[PDB]
Symmetry: D2
Subunit: 349 residues, 4 copies
């Protein structure tokens, strides 16, 4: 024998049905799972102290936005927020439920340097993960997220084989543990934009990484029908003076995905990765002008959904409505982009 045991057909159905709900046409994911230190930076950029009350106010501001569920299929939460009430006393998950937004939970415990690498990172969090998933499920979460990070540095041979091997192994273990506890896993192997590398370099690295990842998912008996991928778009490096055209970014991103991702996977929800809000929309829109695709190409945006929102709010409570208006504008833009119908706002082998 020696093969994977049969998955529960009941569990499998739930995962697959929720995965397709998350990857719904014209919709995508709001990534609001900033940890305490990551949100601190976000708040720093608008001069807001990182208190629990400010975070509760901001998350409530996001999830209590009227009609958000029209463009947002799911919202990724940090554990704090999952068990949190709005300043008015309403549980955050109840806000999501009211809009029909599926709650999701970030489950990794962050990054740690792989010994004897040049600051290359392993993602931690497998310990107790299965037990956390059960609790999170009971709390209302139906999908999870785990962020792995890789860097490009040709001079230093980054990403190294150890980097790729570790990322792949961790993602697969996490994915399988999640599905065992009825959570759709979002597989996020983010290749950072750091550097002055070309888009064609990014494409090569993305292909290698995704190939290793999906081989590992297979080896660990991960149900692709009940999972989602959250990859970087394929772009120039962030130190490049010329940002690639939306056409280029679209071409190479789709190419990289079609070269490595089996089509049983229901959806690819891109991270925005430092891109401006408008690039993130226009780049996604361009990809979906190239449709129909074997899987849904959509978004799982944090910064590219919140940047203007945060700056409209400024920590000022009265600016809540305005901020919410801004969020809707960007949710609509990316929903429309998902369908390749975004108007814009203010073959190479």
């Amino acid at each position: 024998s020696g093969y994977g045991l049969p998955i529960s057909q009941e569990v499998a159905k739930e995962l697959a049905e929720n995965a397709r709900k998350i990857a719904a046409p014209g919709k995508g994911i709001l990534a609001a799972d900033e940890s305490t230190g990551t949100i601190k930076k976000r708040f720093d950029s608008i001069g807001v102290e990182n208190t629990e009350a400010n975070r509760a106010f901001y998350r409530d501001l996001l999830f209590s936005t009227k009609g958000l569920g029209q463009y947002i299929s799911g919202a990724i939460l940090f554990e704090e927020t999952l068990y949190q009430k709005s300043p008015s006393g309403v549980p955050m998950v109840d806000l999501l439920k009211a809009e029909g937004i599926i709650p999701g939970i970030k489950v990794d415990k962050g990054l740690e340097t792989l010994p004897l690498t040049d600051d290359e990172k392993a993602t931690m969090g497998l310990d107790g993960l299965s037990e956390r998933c059960k609790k999170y499920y009971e709390a209302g979460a139906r999908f999870a997220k785990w962020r792995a990070v890789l860097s490009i540095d040709p001079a230093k041979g980054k990403p190294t084989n150890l980097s790729i091997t570790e990322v792949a192994h961790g993602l697969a273990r996490y994915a399988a543990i999640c599905q065992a506890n009825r959570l759709v896993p979002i597989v996020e192997p983010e290749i950072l934009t750091d550097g002055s590398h070309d888009i064609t370099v990014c494409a090569e690295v993305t292909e290698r990484v995704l190939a290793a990842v999906f081989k590992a998912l297979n080896d660990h008996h991960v149900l692709l029908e009940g999972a989602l991928l959250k990859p970087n778009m394929v772009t120039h490096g962030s130190d490049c003076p010329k940002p690639a055209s939306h056409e280029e970014i679209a071409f190479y991103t789709v190419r990289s995905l079609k070269r490595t991702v089996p089509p049983a996977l229901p959806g690819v929800m891109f991270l925005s990765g430092g891109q401006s809000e408008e690039d993130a929309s226009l780049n996604l829109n361009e990809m979906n002008k190239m449709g129909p695709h074997p899987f849904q190409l959509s978004f799982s945006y944090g910064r590219a959904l919140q940047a203007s929102c945060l700056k409209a709010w400024k920590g000022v409570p009265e600016n809540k409505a305005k901020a919410q208006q801004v969020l809707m504008e960007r949710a609509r833009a990316n929903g429309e982009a998902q369908l390749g119908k975004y108007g814009g706002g203010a073959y190479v082998y």
Copy 2:
């Protein structure tokens, strides 16, 4: 650096364009590449001596069939036939060209037992392969074929890891060598039907094998846009009293493919693998009732296109027309099956 060098864009285009021509809608591949010993068996079943003249007569009978190119995009040849003339003196490739059928060439040198395995097989042929490809290209071939074989035997742990590793490695080396010489490679990892295993067993093994294969193709820098897959359908074992329903076979075959095959690959051309001519048609037709698919699902049939043809001919020259009529009937059936429009003739996770 350390990544694959850029492929020639000119070569890449040719491979991709010819691959899509081979995987043309409503069309498929005639596998007439029986080696001297394999054709001997075919002829044995109708009582025909395996002389060069009988083989020349039979191949001419196949390729000189009027209107064959309507349903047959390409024909796989054995080396003999590639450099052969019909009994009337016409080169075999000229017959193919007249129907617009692309010539293809079997390039493997057959099977050899992996030491210290239970009769598990490596495919030989890499030595001189590159040089053979050039000659074959000049002779008019535009695609190639390489058959690897795996067996299922739960009691003996077949296919073993060594088996899968060898198959994958050989296919990838071959594929890359072919593309370097402007030949579209057909990747054929055939999982034999031998045994009394269930269809779900076949599905598991097929997934494992294809996952390993496509990881290897990636590692060897194989252009999927310019390649084709020739896999077994997913079926019960040949010693099973109950042949699975066409619905089942269709479901599990597509599932297995969508779980492992990146969609940049233009086409999957199934081997018939012992199936009756009618099952081979009906099974393919059923898959294409489930369309649209991320890649073309079609055929690369030897026995399932020739069985009745051979028996109509019987070695009798006067039965040539009748035999050709039979071939057309089956080519039409499978072409129609490719489009899911075959009428018939005489979710589980």
Copy 3:
């Protein structure tokens, strides 16, 4: 570039020097790192309640044995014991230090089923491991232990590839994290004796497992000069009526080790794995009659050093001296076995 960064030469020296001290001629390891639930079983077999005071009494009984350091180079502790005082108020580590015994610490967090395997186990504990190692170092530990488990079951294809891959990956990550914090890692891939398999089966599986392990240690930049291996001996399965001869067990164990273990590794310290105290001694002694070996072959025994000791004590405080006498007898026997000079007590390719 892309290779591992240079290890600290200062750290490397410490690891290597302590590893060789642990693998000292005529000496071995006392494994007293039974977790709370594992020690409970031990105490259950002699009718002793598992209170903190009984555990403190028993561990003090072990480590306060006069002259123990003559045969025991190191003692593996459970975290509790590392920060524990004897009933007389003496820190456990101070007892070890007085005999010149190096303290070691079990650092894994136990076992968890790999999803969709037949109860095959991953070892958990990487999360926070690096931080724990620092504390443990400060507490006086100079080596660590991490137990992985594999099972043989030919019918079920155990150990599966996922099992081996997980075990290897976890051991390597742990090893590298330990060395980064100046702890010699003991690599323990235990193949359980469960089953009625032959010794030749055990040998094959042991080889496969160790080959995968040491490839992984290499991939993760683990310094073999500063590590130790704690493997099963190669034996018949525990359900076999005939326990193999000491000669056989010796032959196949050494063979398996020499076929897979690079000789830069200073020592192999065997787990006793259910063997009687006398078999564990006689089997080790037989191996060292076959010397000189490329590495030290010695012991890291829990049950095979404590079985009689526990039964002499019976929870009765007055039996302390007698119990300590028994421990010395077995420590002497195994030390003498290490040198192939044990008298006994009460080529196949």
Copy 4:
């Protein structure tokens, strides 16, 4: 099941016994297997036309040297020479037999560029290899040789993963095929000296390569007891102005071997790889001052045994005796080096 079938104990014994005979103390291998084009270069450097008669004369000159068998355990032959007679009519193998020198045969078919690599090389020759081995055995050969080549180029990421994977896979297939036909395989993964890299770079690459190789040998069921390794010494790159000290070269070479090579392997017979005759002797001698080692460290020298010999001969028949005298001087030097008793002639983690 799924593991390798049991090897023939009779075959295994022969391989192991002949391997130990080849790796005999105070002895090593004369590599005289220069192909037609490689010998041409050798002859070019002394102004000799590459006729069959000159080659027959030179090989006879080598193998007819009186007392050669005192220092030479085996001689590697090119196929031509294996079936060749000396100018006096004596079969070359009969010359070897008279000195008790074991005949060995080069069985690879040379190198071919891996597609889409920067001129990285696969070794060809598996096709028909098994059949060739049988003939060669009958002709008197009892061991074989297969040369794989890797290059170091940090800027280009050489050796790439594809390079290492291909080398390892080819060596393992070859090794297993050889043992199946009763030939001891010499595993030669030569890392070329090309470049200005440091010795520590060479050491890292050598370790990675050997780790991959020996994992592959294990996966293919290669009997290490009946095989030999022919690796590069660990040195600075050939474009380095400072040739490393003999002490350094000795340290890092042994270190690299002990870190990767299981001790069941009977012998490591170094290639000379461009080193002067005297360096090749002094470097080997230095390693064996560091003994005793887990395996025999010896030589399999071509250029470092023949350089002066060729220049003494100059194509002049009368210089035969002188040339033979020179060969003995160098055979004695390297034999003495094998034992660490060469007088000379005219821990870092």
